């Protein structure tokens, strides 16, 4: 029955649970964390506890904080450090993420992902768009030939961009981290008056390392069409396969 956790192990397990609730990881390693919490923190670690910690870190933030995501009330050596760093290294051991605390721009960017639109059925659009040309409204593409690097700026986070045989690093205004799992890119979600997801993320790819030679992004592109009266909710949806391979000409 011995499930004693060391401080680093317990912290990694807490971070794994945080990542799981952020929907960045599908798994967690947390066995023995209830007693670890009740012993090294003094409070219960139920779901509500985690929700409130993530809330008060990313929203309703209060000045200084510690590595366990605890703040010092409002006004101003274990957890009693409360050293507001520029970042927090949420590392569970299985997946790392550099999460940023609240400011004046992260509070402006918090949207409430609580519903979802109906997009458009499927406009007769092409599936073999390249990188240079896009013309999408949800997608912006930057190519730094000086670094052999590609930034894929997305403007519509609800529209997914599944990766395949790819190794990317997405930088958000809430948390920067790298993704290698093929499929939908996973973004953090705080439940605070609803589920809150970041307003935009950026997908950087290093074309140097041949790691993303076979990298294919299947995504959805948005372009206005014809209007029966006004372009009132003019149609704008068609699937597309974007290739990153270093194919000349």
């Amino acid at each position: 029955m011995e499930i004693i956790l060391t401080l680093s192990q317990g912290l990694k397990k807490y971070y794994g649970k945080i990542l799981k609730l952020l929907h960045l990881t599908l798994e967690e390693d947390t066995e023995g964390l209830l007693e670890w919490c009740k012993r090294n923190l003094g409070s219960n670690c139920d779901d509500d506890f985690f929700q409130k910690r993530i809330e008060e870190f990313f929203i309703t933030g209060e000045g200084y904080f510690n590595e366990v995501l605890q703040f010092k009330t409002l006004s101003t050596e274990p957890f009693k450090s409360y050293f507001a760093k520029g970042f927090l290294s949420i590392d569970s051991g299985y997946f790392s993420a550099k999460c940023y605390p609240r400011s004046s721009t992260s509070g402006l960017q918090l949207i409430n992902v609580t519903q979802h639109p109906a997009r458009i059925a499927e406009t007769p659009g092409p599936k073999t768009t390249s990188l240079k040309t896009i013309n999408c409204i949800n997608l912006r593409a930057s190519v730094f030939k000086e670094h052999r690097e590609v930034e894929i700026n997305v403007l519509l986070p609800q529209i997914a961009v599944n990766l395949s045989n790819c190794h990317v690093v997405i930088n958000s205004h809430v948390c920067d981290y790298s993704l290698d799992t093929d499929g939908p890119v996973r973004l953090p979600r705080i439940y605070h008056e609803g589920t809150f997801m970041p307003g935009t993320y950026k997908i950087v790819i290093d074309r140097k390392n041949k790691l993303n030679d076979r990298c294919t992004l299947v995504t959805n592109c948005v372009i206005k069409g014809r209007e029966v009266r006004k372009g009132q909710s003019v149609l704008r949806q068609y699937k597309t396969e974007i290739k990153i391979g270093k194919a000349p000409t």
Epitope: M1, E2, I4, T6, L7, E35, S43, P78, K80
Partner: antibody
Framework: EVQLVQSGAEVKKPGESLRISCKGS????????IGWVRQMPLEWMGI????????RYSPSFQQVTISADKSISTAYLQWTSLKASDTAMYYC???????????????WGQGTLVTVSS | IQMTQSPSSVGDRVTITCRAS??????LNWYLLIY???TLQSGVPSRFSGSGSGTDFTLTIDFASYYC???????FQGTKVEFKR
């Protein structure tokens, strides 16, 4: 140097409320954890942080209440209803990487005798 | 959750051992006398020495009462060491 002075011995009746204290000097009363330990005529009772704090009562041992006022650097241990089983000596102790080398250090007061009798 | 429930003269330099119900690394602070299961506190004579591991520890040597403590939940048994004639 560092000194811990406890409140005097208390003789109360069963059902009477009681509050004993422990005042610290020679140190900030904000960084080194401070706890209470029972010895019936040693049983660990509780601990709290000396500054802004919650409380770490021993499992199952928690009906008493441990608190503290950092404005006067004084910790408190109180009973709402004393029982004859609470007649014992109660020691307050200041104590300084994981569990070892940490707050359960026992880095002590003179002891407070509490006698519950009608 | 159980804890340390299994433990253990005419001027005879002796030794007191101790066990536990689970592994507890190397704390068992003995009383202040010895912490870190071996380290001596500033102001304690060097004749007191500590050793052992989580399953069982030893303290090798003023005849009085003594015993140890865990640094996790539960903490502290009592042995009385004075007897002659």
């Amino acid at each position: 140097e560092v000194q811990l002075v406890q409140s005097g011995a208390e003789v109360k009746k069963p059902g009477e409320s009681l509050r004993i204290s422990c005042k610290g000097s020679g140190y900030s009363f904000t960084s080194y954890w401070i706890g209470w330990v029972r010895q019936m005529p040693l049983e660990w009772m509780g601990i709290i942080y000396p500054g802004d704090s919650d409380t770490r009562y021993s499992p199952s041992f928690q009906q008493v209440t441990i608190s503290a006022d950092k404005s006067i650097s004084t910790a408190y241990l109180q009973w709402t209803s004393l029982k004859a089983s609470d007649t014992a000596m109660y020691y307050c102790a200041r104590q300084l990487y994981y569990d070892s080398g940490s707050y359960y250090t026992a880095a002590w007061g003179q002891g407070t005798l509490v006698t519950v009798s009608s | 959750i159980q804890m340390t429930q299994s433990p253990s003269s005419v001027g005879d330099r002796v030794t007191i051992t101790c066990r536990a119900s689970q592994s507890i690394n190397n704390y068992l602070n003995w009383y202040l006398l010895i912490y870190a299961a071996s380290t001596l506190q500033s102001g304690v004579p060097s004749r007191f020495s500590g050793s052992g591991s989580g399953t069982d520890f030893t303290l090798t040597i003023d005849f009085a009462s003594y015993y140890c403590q865990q640094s996790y939940r539960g903490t502290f048994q009592g042995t009385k060491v004075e007897f002659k004639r």
